[PDB]
RNA sequence: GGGAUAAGUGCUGAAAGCAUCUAAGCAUGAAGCCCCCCUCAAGAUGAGAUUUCCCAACGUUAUAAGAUCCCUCAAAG
RNA sequence: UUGGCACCUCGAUGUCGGCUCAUCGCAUCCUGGGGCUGUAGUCGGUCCCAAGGGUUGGGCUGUUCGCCCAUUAAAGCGGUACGCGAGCUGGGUUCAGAACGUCGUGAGACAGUUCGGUCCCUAUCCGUCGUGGGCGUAGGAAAUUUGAGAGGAGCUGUCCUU
RNA sequence: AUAUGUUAAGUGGAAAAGGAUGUGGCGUUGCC
């Protein structure tokens, strides 16, 4: 998990979602898992 | 009842004669050590030709104390002096002989070589 | 909703089926009527979202009452075993203690070779939860694949 | 569970199996009687009231607690027992296994039973922070004028006050204390004595309450 | 040890035909939160409960149950 | 923190370090939970949650700091008048003596140094720790109690077995 | 209180670069 103010897709498979009022990026690549914070 | 700066006779032939206690091992804030406990010490007095020399920082196991120890049967044993034995990491004595009586609690401490070499185990 | 817009089962509306493989009742959203077929009132955002999810839940109820659901887990690794201790499952997955997963109502366990476990039930959510717990007992590890994985799930493998 | 009242007699020792020395406290628990049964329906909770150490009957012009007053005498007669010196409630036990007026014998406990013992610790009067709170002394030499004082009691302008709970001199001891997970060493039906491993609160002759251990 | 949670992990699931831990639902998950353990506690003026004891006449006098004064004391001070 | 400003205090708001006693924050040192890893394992790196508890004994120096010795699960960083002198000390620092270097014609002086050098106060109020008396609690009284609420406690090592 | 709409953050009831399928209103265009 990368916790960062700037969350954005890192490849074409990254998907931007919103969970519990937080902007996240989920991906097949676990390294690309991101949460805003 | 051995604490920092307590001086101890050495009850072996490793070269050290008197040591000064640097630290009582076995946890933060530990103040006192007794028979079977391990101390870090410095050799203040040595005999010529010994393996252990004056100024060395070594580890020793306490083998008799003036405070003595209490056994579960309500009996006690006390000695006339505080004496220790210089040891290696393997708990084996650095010297090849042990002088004077040692307490039987060393056996529970697993200092079996020291117990074997002691002339009397009480 | 494109998702939002039966058989001899009851479908007797809250809903409560009486199909072959059990009843499987629930409540469903309280602002959506049915004629079956659900209908979306007021066309709002929440209305459309709830219409879609209610239709999905109803289809799931029908499928489970008719032909049930089955999730399959496989254990990978030398010595890994899954026994059926009566009704419950017992897992030997490399721990110092066997793991006891207790069976539940409208849910049945099966084991093949004491390696491939199967969970069967009327309720899709309950079957999924049971399978997820059996997986969570010891999930797959990326270096050798050892663990209780889903039968048709891809495992990402890393080198040494 | 189980409960009894007694007087602390004193400390002694015994030799256990394999000869180990077991320090023990002798408790004399004679004359224990169930005086009342409190229930949820009437009292709102389940408990048994136990009286201990019979006292003298009521007499006119009694001047001390040695003689029962009329309220206490009526309370005891309702149980058909002599008036008792000490009365305590036990909530841990099961009230359906006792009758009003029945004796609670030392044979209630058995050797090896794990118990909690409650009692009033020994009083010590007015004591300072060194003994009462176990604080450090100041230096005893090197010009020091600070030996057994409690030290600083707060901070500066913030907060301009001493906080509640500051440790200061005051009366020490005489507090209810429960020692947990002691063991019953021996029960002696004659002499009505229980031997408790270890030591318990209070002076000799002080009242102690023995209960089955909560943990 | 019990309950509820954090970061997490999910199941079912639409908006968005798919995907998605979430939007509605359903789980799980910390030495931490609330209890569990110990002590004080009804001036808790919201002043609670139980058992037992006592019962008068003309503010006054004498009293009940019950306390004290005074005296011998210590486990208390 | 070093500063900038000069708004409270010059009919006085005692300055550094230490001792005693703490208390709070979390940007967490340890312990608990978790994601990623260029995570094989044992170890690590990094980020997230988490303030319950814990978090050392010496050599040198007035020291704070820092270095070192030996430990420890760990030896966290900060706030509280750089917490705390009507609680203590008084080594240092604004005092009278004296000396060195240096500057000054001199009296004397110091990005300096050196030896010596008086620490007052019987607690009124609030606050805090204990301990009594009065009245109230719709009769009076003895004993046993419920628990609204409050306080306490909360750490962790090593070894064997698997 | 009245009418119309916006917000779901207790935003309202203290802040930035920057990040984001949060949600309302104008639109310009590509495909059908
Ligand atoms: C020991 C008693 C003296 O206290 C002190 O000396 C101290 C320890 F209390 C002291 O020094 C206080 C603390 C001083 O006050 C500080 O002054 C600073 C400038 C400021 C500070 N604050 C405001 C920041 C003030 O608190 C000062 C000036 O005293 C000199 C206070 C003033 C009011 C003052 O002069 C008073 C009157 C001072 N004094 C002159 C002593 C003069 C010196 N002396 C004489 C004697 C003596 C005489 C006769 C016989 C014997 N055996 C001894 N002992 N000591 C006395 O005769 O008595 C006291 C109270
Ligand atoms: K009351
Ligand atoms: Mg970036
Ligand atoms: Mg000290
Ligand atoms: Mg003195
Ligand atoms: Mg400033
Ligand atoms: Mg100006
Ligand atoms: Mg001034
Ligand atoms: Mg003034
Ligand atoms: Mg944090
Ligand atoms: Mg020296
Ligand atoms: Mg200060
Ligand atoms: Mg002060
Ligand atoms: Mg001069
Ligand atoms: Mg000159
Ligand atoms: Mg001198
Ligand atoms: Mg409470
Ligand atoms: Mg706000
Ligand atoms: Zn990606």
Swiss-Prot record, chain A:
Q: Which InterPro entries match?
A: Ribosomal_bL36, Ribosomal_bL36_sp
> Domain of life of the organism in this record?
Bacteria
Query: Mind listing the GO biological process terms from this record?
Result: translation
The record's Gene Ontology cellular component field reads: cytoplasm; ribonucleoprotein complex; ribosome
Concerning Pfam families, the annotation shows: Ribosomal_L36 (PF00444)
Q: Which GO terms describe its molecular function?
A: structural constituent of ribosome
UniProt keyword list? Ribonucleoprotein, Ribosomal protein
Family that this chain belongs to = Belongs to the bacterial ribosomal protein bL36 family.
Q: What is this protein called?
A: Large ribosomal subunit protein bL36
- Organism field: Staphylococcus aureus (strain USA300)
Q: What lineage, starting at the top, does this entry show?
A: Bacteria, Bacillati, Bacillota, Bacilli, Bacillales
Q: What is the primary gene name for this protein?
A: rpmJ
Swiss-Prot record, chain B:
Q: What InterPro entries does the database record attribute to this sequence?
A: Ribosomal_uL14 (IPR000218), Ribosomal_uL14_bac-type (IPR005745), Ribosomal_uL14_CS (IPR019972), Ribosomal_uL14_sf (IPR036853)
Which Gene3D superfamilies has this protein been placed in?
Ribosomal protein L14 (2.40.150.20)
What biological process terms from GO does the record include? translation
| GO MF annotation: an example | large ribosomal subunit rRNA binding
A Gene Ontology CC term for this entry? cytosolic large ribosomal subunit
Keyword line: Ribonucleoprotein, Ribosomal protein, RNA-binding, rRNA-binding
Pfam families attached to this UniProt entry: Ribosomal_L14
SMART domains in UniProt = Ribosomal_L14 (SM01374)
Of which family is this protein a member?
Belongs to the universal ribosomal protein uL14 family.
Q: What does this protein do?
A: Binds to 23S rRNA. Forms part of two intersubunit bridges in the 70S ribosome.
PANTHER family in the cross-refs: 50S/60S RIBOSOMAL PROTEIN L14/L23, LARGE RIBOSOMAL SUBUNIT PROTEIN UL14M
Assembly and oligomerization: Part of the 50S ribosomal subunit. Forms a cluster with proteins L3 and L19. In the 70S ribosome, L14 and L19 interact and together make contacts with the 16S rRNA in bridges B5 and B8.
Q: What is this protein called?
A: Large ribosomal subunit protein uL14
Which source organism does the UniProt entry give? Staphylococcus aureus (strain USA300)
Gene designation = rplN
Swiss-Prot record, chain C:
InterPro entries xref list: Ribosomal_uL6-like, Ribosomal_uL6-like_a/b-dom_sf, Ribosomal_uL6_a/b-dom, Ribosomal_uL6_bac-type, Ribosomal_uL6_CS
Gene3D superfamilies listed in its UniProt record: Ribosomal protein L6, alpha-beta domain (3.90.930.12)
The answer to whether keyword Protein transport applies is no
A Gene Ontology MF term for this entry?
structural constituent of ribosome
Short name of one Pfam family:
Ribosomal_L6
Q: Which domain of life is it from?
A: Bacteria
Q: Which UniProt keywords apply?
A: Ribonucleoprotein, Ribosomal protein, RNA-binding, rRNA-binding
Its quaternary structure? Part of the 50S ribosomal subunit.
PANTHER family with a match to the protein in the record: 60S/50S RIBOSOMAL PROTEIN L6/L9, LARGE RIBOSOMAL SUBUNIT PROTEIN UL6M
Instruction: Report the sequence similarity comment from the record.
Output: Belongs to the universal ribosomal protein uL6 family.
Instruction: State the function annotated in the UniProt record.
Output: This protein binds to the 23S rRNA, and is important in its secondary structure. It is located near the subunit interface in the base of the L7/L12 stalk, and near the tRNA binding site of the peptidyltransferase center.
By what name is this protein known?
Answer: Large ribosomal subunit protein uL6
What is the species listed in this Swiss-Prot or TrEMBL entry?
Answer: Staphylococcus aureus (strain USA300)
The gene from which this protein is expressed is rplF
UniProtKB/Swiss-Prot annotation, chain D:
One Pfam family it belongs to: Ribosomal_L3
What are the recorded Gene Ontology BP terms? Answer: translation
MF terms in GO: rRNA binding; structural constituent of ribosome
Spell out the InterPro entries in the cross-references: Ribosomal_uL3, Ribosomal_uL3_bac/org-type, Ribosomal_uL3_CS, Transl_B-barrel_sf
Coiled-coil ranges (or none)? none
Specify whether Transport is a keyword of the entry: no
Return the annotated region ranges for Disordered: 129-155
Cellular component terms per the entry's GO annotation: cytosolic large ribosomal subunit
The entry's function note states: One of the primary rRNA binding proteins, it binds directly near the 3'-end of the 23S rRNA, where it nucleates assembly of the 50S subunit.
Q: Please give the family membership noted in the entry.
A: Belongs to the universal ribosomal protein uL3 family.
Task: Kindly state the subunit structure of this protein.
Answer: Part of the 50S ribosomal subunit. Forms a cluster with proteins L14 and L19.
What name does UniProt use for this protein?
Answer: Large ribosomal subunit protein uL3
Q: State the species of origin.
A: Staphylococcus aureus (strain USA300)
